[PDB]
Amino acid sequence: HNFSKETLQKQAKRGFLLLERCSLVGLQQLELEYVNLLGRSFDSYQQKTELLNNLKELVDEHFSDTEKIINTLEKIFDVIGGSEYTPVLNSFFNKLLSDPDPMQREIGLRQFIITLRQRFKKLSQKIDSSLKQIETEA
Amino acid sequence: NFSKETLQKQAKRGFLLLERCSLVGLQQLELEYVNLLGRSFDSYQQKTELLNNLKELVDEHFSDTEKIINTLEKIFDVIGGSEYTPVLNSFFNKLLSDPDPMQREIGLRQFIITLRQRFKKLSQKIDSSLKQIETEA
Amino acid sequence: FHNFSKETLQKQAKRGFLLLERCSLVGLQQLELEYVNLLGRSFDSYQQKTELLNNLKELVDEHFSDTEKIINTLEKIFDVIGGSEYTPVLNSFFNKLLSDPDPMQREIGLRQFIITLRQRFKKLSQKIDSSLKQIETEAK
Amino acid sequence: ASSFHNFSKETLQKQAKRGFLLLERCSLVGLQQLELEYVNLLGRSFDSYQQKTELLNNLKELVDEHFSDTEKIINTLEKIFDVIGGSEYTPVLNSFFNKLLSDPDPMQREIGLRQFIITLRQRFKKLSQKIDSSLKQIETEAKA
């Protein structure tokens, strides 16, 4: 309740562009980097494990940064959610963020967040699986 | 020496550097490191070289970051504990937008710390890796 | 480009380079990883595996081509402002020279980046072809 | 649709230019992203099928949407050329995708632009084609 309602719109927008252009793009890399590690035959194990932990640490870090953004974005919606001031975003990927109806643009954004979380969670989960699989194999 | 509200405006600009430029660079570098590890191809002489290279970049950036922080601390020497602590929407800390200026000061200090932690932690890994590789030949 | 304002060219050169860094290279990094990812996948079949490489190959060639086009324009720009003060300044996080005060260095930096980029692209297409041969002989 | 013969010939130049910067800086960039997104989907093992198919349809829809927006721009750009085509007023554009748009000769700049359009269309069509192939491949992979 502290800022101008349209300033929040502008912020919300910026916030979201982070998620799309930075947060998600990092995540796509990381998913691929994981697969890449698995592909590298056996190495030793001490060496393989190390690289996952290493990966894991980065993913947790980046997930955390992502969450912080989301969090600030949700807090913004605490004011402009269910309002006209829901920002408009020509995303190439979720079609709803450009929708003329602000309800839809809200939905769109919530979806994007969920999706993003799903994917992050799902990655940390695989990495942990792999680390257990390797643990027991050694 | 300067107008108390000019310093506010500067502090704000200073901080937007940290968030929008310093941190973003750091996030990239963290990812670049991981990327190097992932790459088999090379030899070792070639692998090592790329880390040193990375290392140099990180130390360079860390240095630039420290310089900003330093200026920002100096600014707070004046407007710390005051009403003129700038207000910043931010996606990395909720306190910078807080109506209470004390909180906004705390927020900023936290951000700095967190940043330093991350930078230090990276240079540390890079050095570990460089030793690991050293011994592996 | 013998036609444009020397500082307009600076601004263009800069924009050109941000493409390479922020778009061209970022795509390339993903593609390299996508290749490795394909190799990692069992079972699929073969008809299905090959198809996905060709598919990848096509994209890489396409994106390499787009990258070359940019470079090309960038070289043409340097035909004018190469060896000049108007060489653009770029805080890249990756090549340190593009921010150098000396414009000679900034030129060198840029040339290096290009080379590096080409190396990486060429090297990828070459692996993909190897793999496609390896697979060809392993099946048909 | 409409026609332009009536606007100021240099206003059209300015518009044509703006129109083209859309294609280069927005339309093409979107397309490059989409091509990469497709490849990315194929790469993903994990999910199911109902889930895989869905994401393609989704992609497909986006591509058709974007292609449509692109066509609309082109269309306007062609209409503009109906007037300033074969003229001196063909706009001048530095470009990283075609060397001809900066050419001093306006004939060349016209050629350049036409080429860019074509190329763009080729790429868009080619993507929708692959996506449809993939969707059939997946469809048949469900069976007895």
Residue numbers in the entry:
A (entry chain C): 66 to 203
B (entry chain B): 67 to 203
C (entry chain A): 65 to 204
D (entry chain D): 62 to 205
Describing publication, verbatim:
M. genitalium has a flask-shaped morphology that consists of a cell body with a protrusion of the cell membrane, called the terminal organelle, which is the scaffold for cell adhesion, division and motility, processes deeply related to infectivity. M. genitalium MG200 and MG491 proteins have been proposed as components of the terminal organelle wheel complex ultrastructure and in agreement with this, it has recently been found that MG200 and MG491 interact with each other specifically influencing cell motility. In this work, the crystal structure of MG491 was determined and found to present a unique tetrameric organization as a dimer of asymmetric pairs of subunits. The structural characterization of MG491 in this work, indicates that MG491 subunits are composed of three distinct regions with a 60-residue N-terminus, a central three-helix-bundle spanning about 150 residues and a C-terminal region that contains the residues that interact with MG200 and appears to be mostly unstructured.
The structure determined for MG491 subunits consists of an antiparallel three-helix-bundle, with helices α1 (residues 70–102), α2 (111–145) and α3 (167–203) connected by loops L1 (103–110) and L2 (146–166), respectively. Helix α1 is kinked in its central part, due to the insertion of a π-helix turn starting in residue Cys87. Therefore, about sixty residues in the N-terminal region of MG491 appear to be flexible with respect to the subunit three-helix-bundle domain. The four MG491 subunits found in the crystal asymmetric unit present three different types of intersubunit interfaces that were named symmetric, tight and loose. The symmetric interface, with a total buried area of ~650 Å2, corresponds to interactions across the two-fold symmetry axis and involves only subunits A and C, while subunits B and D do not contact with each other. The tight interfaces, with a total buried area of ~2*1200 Å2, correspond to the two interfaces between subunits in the pairs A/D and C/B (within each pair subunits are related by ~72° rotation). The loose interfaces, with a total buried area of ~2*450 Å2, correspond to the two interfaces between subunits in the pairs A/B and C/D (within each pair subunits are related by ~108° rotation). The organization of the MG491 tetramer, with only a two-fold symmetry, can be defined as a dimer (C2 molecular symmetry) of asymmetric pairs of subunits. Loop L2 mediates interactions in both the tight and the loose interfaces presenting a different conformation in each interface. In the MG491 tetramer, the four Cys87 residues (Cys87 is the only cysteine in the whole MG491 sequence) are located close to each other, in particular across the symmetric interface, suggesting the possible formation of disulfide bonds between subunits.
